[PDB]
Design a binder for this molecule. Structure first.
Ligand SMILES: *Cc1c(COP(=O)(O)O)cnc(C)c1O
Ligand SMILES: *Cc1c(COP(=O)(O)O)cnc(C)c1O
Lengths: 396, 396
């Protein structure tokens, strides 16, 4: 059976952790994957989730299976964080969320649902985008098409071109948007542009799939959901795949959510029973620890208040590092003006480096970036800021 | 998009938990799903996993992502438990295991792999079998076909007929077998019959998929793996989907394993890089808590010794209840001889009840069984043994 099976290409993001850990040169710098690090270069588990894990250890009685859709308290808090305290989707029983194994689990379950229960042929994804989008939809059966986004010269969102390529997206097609913190560019639309986009979507009949992985890392939790909320107010149907791996630092417990909205409660519930049938034939029900922890923190005032400060601290450290990277690049030789990275939101930096410059930085200096030029800013500390800036100058 | 989507049929096993929890009659009896209960009717979290969770709380530093395949120590212990201390597959670097979200996650990842990377068209499943088998393979793309198993009159495995229906399974087809504790019959082959089956498989060129959910609940951990070990010794290629939800009482943390074996290390590794590519486009990597706990218990001598006693206690309670169910059924009116259930291994009892008798028991008396006649013996305690036996007699 297995004789002619060729090896698969390494994952562009995930494959770097392999090489990084096989390196054995003492001064290497990882900069690759979107995991946060502190001034010390470590990824600590948050104080607020430790407090919650202690609680759960003292307070659980059973490990018996969860429902297909997971914990109810989890699903209701997720809806509030995304849609608003007193929203109409919530009050009209127009939304249902299932707890998933991470945001990728949420994206596959949506893909599986639409493939089986809809007439969707195409999903539209931005150029550039998270590399694994194309792979989750292709395994479900769906064609991936691209819409222009970001012009490289002026380091801006090229709005007129995003309109003009989406003009050939048919009524019925899926269109993925990033809620906030575009991966990999870090360039999101203004609220005025999101308005212009909510409009058009309704004029043309596209189904919006919103992807959230970084809510809280751009301006704040509420401020970052205003593009999704501008769309909710105009739409009858929407699906959103959400993740809590980044803003809760719960990367390996696999906590996310796939939330479905339709016109009324009867229609969302008919649809949701199909979504649960797709879940049952993949894993059977969701992992409990991670989501049990989110709900506990979100349900307690003391623990919620501590969490939001911990996340405010991470957003601010990343901002300090963004400017330091730019000031240092200029002090050490940079032949280009890299001011434009101060204008991007999130963990990343679409630096502009060519694939050969990225390949060299790795080979000769051991600093690890993705071959697109994306570098994780939250990987940078005061102590490794001069080494890696020097290393870039040499390769320019 | 969602307007004409009909509702899905309720899950035959999972849908009973809904009805049971909506019932509000004080004396109901659940008996449906394969979750163990103690003399008190509760499902406690094991002492040995509590000790391990305490340890992990004290001793973790980070929640940063795991590898696509999960924890190495987890995968190596899983291989020993299944194949043997000093086995040749282990020594010849012929097996690779990935950590999955439960045994169902393990079955889907195998289905996905074979669909994408092989020429498999058919999977052969026993009649009867776990109801959700057909659903995981159909979502992957594969046809499910059935082989005879178990004759209802003599309450035995009908070996000659299992041979004769499998005679039309072609070279290249998958054939699922249950390692031990057949769900739902509780009837496994003798070691002599497993030998006869290992033989034939090699003569005909079928790829064996072994499913394990109950290792340890039939005779003991080592004794229950001897059919799989009889097959390993003859085969070049095998895949096994394993679960730790039942024998570790870790039902909602979602811990399993999908282990691939091929002829040599180069071939297993080429094949395994494809299996990891299917994992990346489903969830991205596995949930850590559950598997971190299995590995900790399996790695410590004190905690391992406590675990094996906890599992010996569960196997024995289920055995006490099997006999009590039979002695009581006869004392209260049973018009049939139900001795045959003392001859079955595992949590269950394929009682023989008709779907209308099962539907009545529920409606009128509130005892919940699956519509096939399967009842969970581990749900029975000394205190609810007389109520439910009476309730069956009334319906006979
Ligand atoms: C991190 C990330 C994901 C994956 O989320 P998980 O919660 O780890 O599954 C998906 N998409 C984007 C853009 C991400 O940054
Ligand atoms: C329990 C069970 C499964 C599911 O295992 P999980 O580990 O819960 O995913 C699959 N097949 C059979 C026969 C089972 O009994």
């Amino acid at each position: 059976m297995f004789e002619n099976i060729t090896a698969a290409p390494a994952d562009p993001i995930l494959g770097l952790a392999d090489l990084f850990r096989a390196d054995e040169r003492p001064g290497k710098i990882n900069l690759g994957i979107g995991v946060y690090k502190d001034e010390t270069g470590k990824t600590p588990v948050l104080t607020s989730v430790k407090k919650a894990e202690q609680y759960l250890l003292e307070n659980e009685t059973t490990k018996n299976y969860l429902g297909i859709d997971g914990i109810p308290e989890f699903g209701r808090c997720t809806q509030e964080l995304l849609f608003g305290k007193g929203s109409a989707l919530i009050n009209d029983k127009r939304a249902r969320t299932a707890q998933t194994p991470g945001g990728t689990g949420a994206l596959r379950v949506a893909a599986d649902f639409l493939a089986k229960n809809t007439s969707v042929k195409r999903v539209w994804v931005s150029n550039p985008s998270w590399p694994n989008h194309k792979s989750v939809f292709n395994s479900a059966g769906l064609e991936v098409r691209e819409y222009a986004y970001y012009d490289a010269e002026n380091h801006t969102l090229d709005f007129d071109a995003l309109i003009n390529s989406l003009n050939e997206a048919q009524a019925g097609d899926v269109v993925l948007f990033h809620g906030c913190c575009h991966n990999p560019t870090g360039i999101d639309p203004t609220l005025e542009q999101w308005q212009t986009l909510a409009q058009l979507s309704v004029e043309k009949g596209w189904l919006p799939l919103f992807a959230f992985a970084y809510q809280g890392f751009a301006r704040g939790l509420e401020e970052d959901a205003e593009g999704l909320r501008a769309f909710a107010a105009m739409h009858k149907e929407l699906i959103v795949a959400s993740s809590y791996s980044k803003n809760f630092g719960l990367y390996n417990e696999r906590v996310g959510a796939c939330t479905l909205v339709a016109a009324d409660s009867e229609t969302v519930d008919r649809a949701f029973s199909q979504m649960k049938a797709a879940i049952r034939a993949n894993y059977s029900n969701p992992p409990a620890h991670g989501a049990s922890v989110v709900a506990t923190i979100l349900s307690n005032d003391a623990l919620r208040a501590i969490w939001e400060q911990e996340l405010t601290d991470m957003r601010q450290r990343i901002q300090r590092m963004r400017q330091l990277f730019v000031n240092t690049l200029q002090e050490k030789g940079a032949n280009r003006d890299f001011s434009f990275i101060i204008k991007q939101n999130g963990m990343f930096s679409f630096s502009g480096l060519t694939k050969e410059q990225v390949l060299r930085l790795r080979e000769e200096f051991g600093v690890y970036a993705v071959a697109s030029g994306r570098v994780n800013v939250a990987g940078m500390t005061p102590d490794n800021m001069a080494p890696l800036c020097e290393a870039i100058v040499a390769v320019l």
